[PDB]
Every structure is written in structure tokens, then in C-alpha cells.
Design a protein around this ligand. Sequence first.
Ligand SMILES: N=C(N)NC(=O)c1nc(Cl)c(N)nc1N
Ligand SMILES: N=C(N)NC(=O)c1nc(Cl)c(N)nc1N
Ligand SMILES: N=C(N)NC(=O)c1nc(Cl)c(N)nc1N
Ligand SMILES: *[C@@H]1O[C@H](CO)[C@@H](O)[C@H](O)[C@H]1NC(C)=O
Ligand SMILES: *[C@@H]1O[C@H](CO)[C@@H](O)[C@H](O)[C@H]1NC(C)=O
Ligand SMILES: [Cl-]
Ligand code: NA
Ligand code: NA
Ligand code: NA
Lengths: 410, 60, 118
Amino acid sequence: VVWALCFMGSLALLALVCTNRIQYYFLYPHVTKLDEVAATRLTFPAVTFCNLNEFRFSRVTKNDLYHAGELLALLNNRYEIPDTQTADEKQLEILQDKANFRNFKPKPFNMLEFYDRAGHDIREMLLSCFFRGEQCSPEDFKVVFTRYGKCYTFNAGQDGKPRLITMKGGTGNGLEIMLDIQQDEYLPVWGETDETSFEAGIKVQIHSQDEPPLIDQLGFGVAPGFQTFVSCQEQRLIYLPPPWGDCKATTGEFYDTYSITACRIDCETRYLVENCNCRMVHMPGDAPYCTPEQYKECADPALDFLVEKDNEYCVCEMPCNVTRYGKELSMVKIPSKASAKYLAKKYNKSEQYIGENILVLDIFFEALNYETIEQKKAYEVAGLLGDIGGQMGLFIGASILTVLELFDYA
Amino acid sequence: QIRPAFCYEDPPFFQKCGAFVDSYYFNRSRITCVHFFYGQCDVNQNHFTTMSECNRVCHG
Amino acid sequence: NLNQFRLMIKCTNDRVWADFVDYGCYCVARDSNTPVDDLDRCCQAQKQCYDEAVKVHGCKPLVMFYSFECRYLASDLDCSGNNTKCRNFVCNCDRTATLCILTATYNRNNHKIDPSRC
Ligand SMILES: N=C(N)NC(=O)c1nc(Cl)c(N)nc1N
Ligand SMILES: N=C(N)NC(=O)c1nc(Cl)c(N)nc1N
Ligand SMILES: N=C(N)NC(=O)c1nc(Cl)c(N)nc1N
Ligand SMILES: *[C@@H]1O[C@H](CO)[C@@H](O)[C@H](O)[C@H]1NC(C)=O
Ligand SMILES: *[C@@H]1O[C@H](CO)[C@@H](O)[C@H](O)[C@H]1NC(C)=O
Ligand SMILES: [Cl-]
Ligand code: NA
Ligand code: NA
Ligand code: NA
């Protein structure tokens, strides 16, 4: 009888091991698997850029200045050129005249229309553009409005345009653009607002076509007076949805592929509508566009707060698919002394102008292979069963046969 | 005191102690309840199986 | 602005914002001379608060944004996170008024009434 005690004494211990394995399975654990994937091709990403200056000086009209002057620190709250004028001679004269509102009658005004008309024009900025040996043009850039205003996306892959592709590492197989940032067109800076900057240049974001830019937060800078090389590495991150993980596949609201940025732009929009009863002109939805006074009084502070300071309003669920681009930047000078005169003549500018306004930007991949990092289910059904039946043989000597035998017996 | 004090606690975002499931927590910045994925780390009680429940108990 | 006020109220009160929107004389942020009761007296000191905000500090309490933290205790409702006098001041006008609302009692018959009474 000592045996039947020992047999069910080994059976008890088997039950414990088995419930452990079952409890583990119902945690739905995951592990992370790293891999390097060699490729014959890569989809070239989308490339969004913005001039750091939001409004062309030569495009600001009396009416513009009337509605938006205070926003841009060109006017005080009395609609007057402030005596804190940190301006040269000619520009003050132009602005004084433009600010003469005596017997002026205000016409309708809209910030979106104002960005669209006054913002820098890709057709003037783009001195040249090449992708993989092929010449590209302003028609290859899609307009996208952002917090910086009127911006441009290369290779947006929208409106049925196919996504461009790279097939080798290195500079020849990417994008090269020459731009004129047009500093003579920069708005005089007479104060500090969210729409003005102390800086000259562009902001750039390299991103998947399935995600909108968030260029004020996640871009990188590029300076005039240099050729900048940006050597990229693609990394693909894959997460599991529930019950294994907490990644979110799609959103059934403003954007139809889910990404952190889509999430943040949704939140920001809901937050502005909720707190200001208006949206900024780059945000999606139906709500009215904030007036310049609303930008100044409510929308700029609310968005600044939400980004910088709020800790709970927006907390975005991780997306199941994330494409990320590691980047190595470096710079050389443009123009050389030997090329300044040539560039000056070619674009009808002085050499000083070329030196202050021209930049070249090269974006390309180091190598074609991309890295993948993936959450894998760590203990599926097949693994649970084969583990249970392996513990049988360890505790009892039980088997798939030994088990079928006890149905013949019973 | 209009809503319980646990309503103001952060839910355990991204923390896994088991299976992830749809849940709802009170967001003290929106002042309303919001969907999230709960992974069984019972760190506090700011998590509900349904939106209405969360809105009933914590909305006020 | 009134979106923040409305949220401050929700932070501390289950009474739907509608019931305050046109109630009495002053609710919400409307002018008059004689308040109908205690609740309407809250709005009064609130309207009185905006009017000082405007005239002394140059705030635009009906347009401007401010932030606030909703806490467990209505009393603990916090305005200290604001980074300017105006945002500080107007946040406090709204904090004062939402607390006052908690003291005062609400007569549905003083809600959306005839203009003659004020
Ligand atoms: N001219 C100013 N007053 N600027 C700021 O106040 C400010 N700027 C920046 Cl960039 C910031 N992150 N927070 C701020 N409060
Ligand atoms: N990002 C921010 N937090 N900015 C400010 O706080 C701020 N900025 C500017 Cl530019 C300004 N004129 N006043 C401010 N209070
Ligand atoms: N711990 C493990 N690695 N188990 C298995 O690999 C496994 N075993 C068995 Cl017996 C099976 N049928 N399927 C499996 N996936
Ligand atoms: C999501 O990941 C899968 C697996 O790698 C991939 O096939 C798919 O293209 C990804 N989704 C997107 C939108 O890229
Ligand atoms: C170039 O020089 C200035 C630039 O505006 C202009 O006045 C002039 O007409 C231009 N000439 C040509 C040939 O483009
Ligand atoms: Cl955000
Ligand atoms: Na284990
Ligand atoms: Na700024
Ligand atoms: Na708040």
C-alpha cells in the first residue's frame, strides 16, 4: 500500500507543476526578438520641412497687420507700432505706413488663408531637387499645415502617388535639395510670441507616410550656410495586442492609421475645442478656426500647456507598428569662396545673400538592411500541452499511450 | 469629496501582471473616464470593466 | 474662460452646467444690480471678479486660457500652476465661484426667468 501512497504522492506534485504552467499560460507572456533583415529595397520615407519664419514680410497686407499684428508682436494692444521698435530704417517705414489704419475699414480675415498666402512658397525656396538621379520639382511636395504654418512634404505617398524606393546605401540613392530660406523675407522680430523665432533655417522631420508630422516637437534643425548630410537607419518595432500586450492596431478618430502622433494631434484638437471653442488652422475636424486674438489669448497658451506641462490629459496607447529612423548628421560649408560668385550669378543674388540663405540637404540610407524588434508570444497552446505531457513522463512515467490505456480500462 | 480619492490616481499604464483587457479609468485632467488597457496590476482601484461604471463612481 | 469654469464646476459638482448658464441675474458672467439669492450672489462676486481682472490687470476672462488641477478635495482645487498674474487671477475668480456654488442652494424657479426681476 506504500506504493499507492507514493503514486498519488507523485501525482499531487504533478498537479502543482501543471497548475503553475497553466497559470503562466494565462498570463499570456511575451518575449522580445531582435533581428537584422537584409533587403533589396526600402521604401523611402516622407520628408516634411518648414521654414522657421512663418510669414513672408512682403506678403503681409494692411488688413493682415490689422487682425494679426498683435499676435506677431508688430503691433501693441493699441494697434500701434511699439516704441520698443528694434527695427532698421526701411522696414520701420514700410510697417509704419502699413500700420496707418486711419479711415481704414477691416475686411474679413482667416489664419488659414493667411498662412496659405503669406507662408513661404516651395516654388521660390526650392532652388533644386534630385532623387536618385532624377530631377524633382515643387509638384513633388505636398502642402501640409503644421504649428509652424505652411510646410511641405516630399514623398507623401498621398492622393494616389506611389511611395518612392531606395535600393542602395549612400548618398546617390537618396534625396538632395537646395533651398533658399529667404531671410530678406523674414518678419521683423519686435517681441516674443509663439509665432516668432530668433532662428534662421528650417525644421525637418523624416517619418513614415502612415504618420503625420509633429515637426515642432519631433523635428531636427538644418542651418543655412551648410550642406547637411543625414544618414539614416530604419528600425521596425512590433508589439502584441491584448491579451499578450497593450498595443492598439487601428482607430475607428481623425486619422485612419494609428500612431503616437495621430493620437497626440487628436488630443490637442479635442483640447483646443474644449478649452477655446476653436481649433488651430493645422488641426483636423469641424470646429471654427481660432481668430488671431484666440491664438494669443487661449490657443497658444492651451497648446503650450498641454504639451509642456499637462501630465494626464493625453497618454497615448502604444501602436502595434512603429517605424523609426536612426539618423547621423554632419555638415560642410556652402558656398566655398570659389563657388559663391557662380551661385550668386545663377540665382541673381549677392554673394552675401547666398552665404546667409542657401543650404543643401541630403537624406539617404546608410545601408538597405533594417533592424526589427518584435514581441513574440512566449508560451502558446502547443507549448503548454507538450510541457504538461513532458511533466507526466517525469512524475509518473505517463505517456500518450499510458493515458489512452486508462480509457480502455475505463 | 464628490468622487472617491482613488479616482485621482494614475492607472498602471503599460504595466503587465497578466492578460491585457479593455478597462476604463477616470482622467483627472479631462474630468471624465477614458479607455485603457489594464494588465492586472491591481495597484489601485481606478479601473473599471465598463465606461458607465467608471463614469458613475468617479465622474462625481 | 468659461470652459475652464464649467470644468471647475464639474470638478466639484454634479449639477449640469445648463442650470447655471442663465439662472438668476448674474449666472453666468452677466451683469445686473440686485442678485436673486446666494447662488446668484456667487456669480455677482465672480462677475465683479472678472471686471476687476479686466480693469486692473488687463485680462480677458471670457477669452483667455488658464489651467487648474482638480483634486480630491474641492478646497484643494489648485491654481498655482499658472505662469502669469492674469492666468493666476482669473483662475482664482473661477475657483472662488465654484466653491461658493457649493455653499449656496439651488432654486429651479430662479432659473431662466423674466428680465424684469433684475
Ligand atoms: N518669452 C517668454 N515669456 N517665454 C516663455 O515664457 C517660455 N518659453 C518657453 Cl520655450 C517655454 N518652454 N516656456 C516658457 N514659459
Ligand atoms: N511655451 C511657453 N510656456 N510659453 C510662455 O509661457 C510664454 N511665451 C511667450 Cl513667447 C510669451 N510672450 N509669454 C509667455 N508666457
Ligand atoms: N518548450 C518547448 N519549446 N516546447 C515545444 O517546442 C513543443 N513541444 C511539443 Cl511536444 C509540441 N507538440 N509543440 C511544441 N511547440
Ligand atoms: C504591422 O506589422 C506587420 C508585421 O511586420 C507588417 O506586415 C505591417 O506592414 C505593419 N503595418 C504597417 C501599417 O506597416
Ligand atoms: C535680378 O536682380 C533683381 C532681383 O530682384 C531684379 O531687380 C532684376 O530685374 C533681376 N534680373 C533678372 C535678369 O532676373
Ligand atoms: Cl500633446
Ligand atoms: Na518561466
Ligand atoms: Na517662439
Ligand atoms: Na484641468
